[PDB]
Every structure is written in structure tokens, then in C-alpha cells.
Amino acid sequence: RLSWYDPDFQARLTRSNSKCQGQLEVYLKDGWHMVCSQSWGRSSKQWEDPSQASKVCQRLNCGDPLSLGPFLKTYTPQSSIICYGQLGSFSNCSHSRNDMCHSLGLTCLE
Numbered sequence: 001r002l003s004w005y006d007p008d009f010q011a012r013l014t015r016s017n018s019k020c021q022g023q024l025e026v027y028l029k030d031g032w033h034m035v036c037s038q039s040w041g042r043s044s045k046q047w048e049d050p051s052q053a054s055k056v057c058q059r060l061n062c063g064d065p066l067s068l069g070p071f072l073k074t075y076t077p078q079s080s081i082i083c084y085g086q087l088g089s090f091s092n093c094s095h096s097r098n099d100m101c102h103s104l105g106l107t108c109l110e
Helices: 054-059
Strands: 011-013 024-028 031-034 066-070 081-083 093-095 104-108
Touching (some): 031 081
Antiparallel strands (some): 011 024
16 A cells, blocks of 8 residues: 555654664554564565665655665664565554564665
């Protein structure tokens, strides 16, 4: 239903230290859900795909979308969530337990 490439769908990186770097925070269904970035697809532990969220960082004028790679530890195994399903279907999530996202960090373009 909702996706991070929907114009009306608001998304960005969590308020940290960089308007173009941080964990992914997407407003869907019920929450500015702090995701583990590699949620939904869970394809790899370090996604070779740094795209699909171009609309997001473009709207943040940070250029191309946040590139993905391990950012050590930023989310909280209670507060944040790891969603599932298919990538682009921001209509279902669950809370961070045990997946491949050891706080995978997105950083708009670079």
C-alpha cells in the first residue's frame, strides 16, 4: 500500500547528526517507524542496492538515495522495528529481534 517511493509518503533518516545519513525513519500506518533498513526484503547483510529510496533523499535534497551498509548500532530492540514482506510494501512490520540488520545504516547517496 505505502512505499518509500510514494510522493505523499514521508520518509527520511532518523534525527542524528546528518540530514543525509542515519537509520531509516518512515511514516507509515501508525509510526515514524525506525526500521533496520534491510527490513522487508532482508536480501543480504549489506545490500548492494542503494536505490529505490531516491524520492526520499531527493526530497531531502541530499541527492541520490541513502546507500546501505553496517552502521554499528543505532536502533533499539524495543523502540525500533524490523518490517517484513516485500520491499516497497510499508504496510506491515514487527519489532527488532534477530535478523541481518545489525543497525544497517543508510546514507543519502554517499
